[PDB]
């Protein structure tokens, strides 16, 4: 009906960002890895940009600011790819222009990564995911990355509080059939963790086995 | 007063103890050899106070064992995690056993426990309450998310049960918050992160 913070974070929303393949080289895990490299780097930028629009949060300081992007970059970056591909089936859309199907992720070998990702995307799916919510959880998400460098705690608190607060109160106007969606939606949340820091660490391995 | 969580209270299991083996002199591997001794006692019980959970029990044997298999870890370290809120800096897995920051990296579980540590670090800051854990420990075992599950109905009707049990809880005894609830699911993903890098470190012993 109208939350005032859930239409700021529609609007603070970041524009398409298309992946742009290299058509001159060979389809390989190592192309599919620098392509969706250089696809997180842009979005970085693109998320720094935009958390600044998250209500309340230009207000905390600015070694907290960095704490959380530090943490929760990687739980943005996925739940952006998750929302993508809800209106899709059984593949990614990385990019509108970089979909990857149960092949392209054989290739590339981030089959077990990516068959991760397709089930968060299954239970989102699942419960009808609205743009809204996205954002929500999305905001949420950061706010709620426990860095363990917080100066100012009782700071990050109302942060989470504010953005807590817009989520029960727009799943309280837009669908009382059900009076415990928003706390359902939260609880999505772990897996988006589980599955982020599954992502970090495969990274860590390719890095190690190159 | 909610019937759900009147249970869960009464199936709380009795105290364990890691009993430190007269055995060993202190070193890496007594200290890692008493959790491991620990862990496997407790989930043992862990299984049995699994059968109380409402609507646990209903389930076909093949899921249950699906998230038991996954959840195990949560409970473990959302146990610890209860056992050391009236403390400070210090772990306690069992009255026997109570690891300070030293022993921790004398265990070289310095970076596990220091982040299991962070856990209660909010637990404390809001007062977590007897009532409020059993219903989590619940709730982390059925939202465990496992990849491999039959009934999918059957087990999200059992996540509502709860789900419902702990909105119930708060808005009877806490009035204060209208918040409260999804507070405390908050903290799960830490509990979920925690509880995998306490197992990964587990596994990475020996292997590349
Ligand atoms: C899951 C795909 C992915 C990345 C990704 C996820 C979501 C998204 O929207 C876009 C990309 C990924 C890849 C590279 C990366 O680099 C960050 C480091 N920069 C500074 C070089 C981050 C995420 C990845 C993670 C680990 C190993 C290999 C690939
Ligand atoms: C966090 C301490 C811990 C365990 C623990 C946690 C909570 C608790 O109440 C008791 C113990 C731990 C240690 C061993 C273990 O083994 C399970 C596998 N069995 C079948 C051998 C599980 C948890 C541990 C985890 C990873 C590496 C080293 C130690």
Not at 72 to 99: H, Q, T
Not at 126 to 153: G, W
Not at 163 to 177: C, K, P, V
Request: net charge negative; with cysteine; aromatic share 6%.
């Amino acid at each position: 009906p109208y939350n005032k913070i859930v239409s700021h974070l529609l609007v603070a929303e970041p524009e398409k960002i298309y992946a742009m393949p290299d058509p001159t080289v060979p389809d390989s895990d190592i192309k599919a890895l620098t392509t969706l490299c250089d696809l997180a780097d842009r979005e970085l930028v693109v998320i720094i940009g935009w958390a600044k629009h998250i209500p309340g949060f230009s207000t905390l300081s600015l070694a907290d600011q960095m704490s959380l992007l530090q943490s929760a970059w990687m739980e943005i970056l996925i739940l952006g790819v998750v929302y993508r591909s809800l209106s899709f089936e059984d593949e990614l859309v990385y990019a509108d222009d970089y979909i990857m199907d149960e092949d392209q992720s054989k290739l590339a070998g981030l089959l077990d990564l990516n068959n991760a990702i397709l089930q968060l995307v299954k239970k989102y799916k699942s419960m009808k995911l609205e743009k809204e919510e996205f954002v929500t959880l999305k905001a949420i998400a950061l706010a709620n990355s426990d860095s363990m460098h917080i100066e100012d705690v009782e700071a990050v608190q109302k942060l989470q509080d504010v953005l807590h607060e817009a989520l029960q109160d727009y799943e309280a106007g837009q669908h009382m059939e059900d009076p415990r969606r928003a706390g359902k939606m939260l609880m999505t949340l772990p897996l988006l963790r589980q599955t982020s820091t599954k992502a970090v660490q495969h990274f860590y391995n390719i890095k190690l086995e190159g």
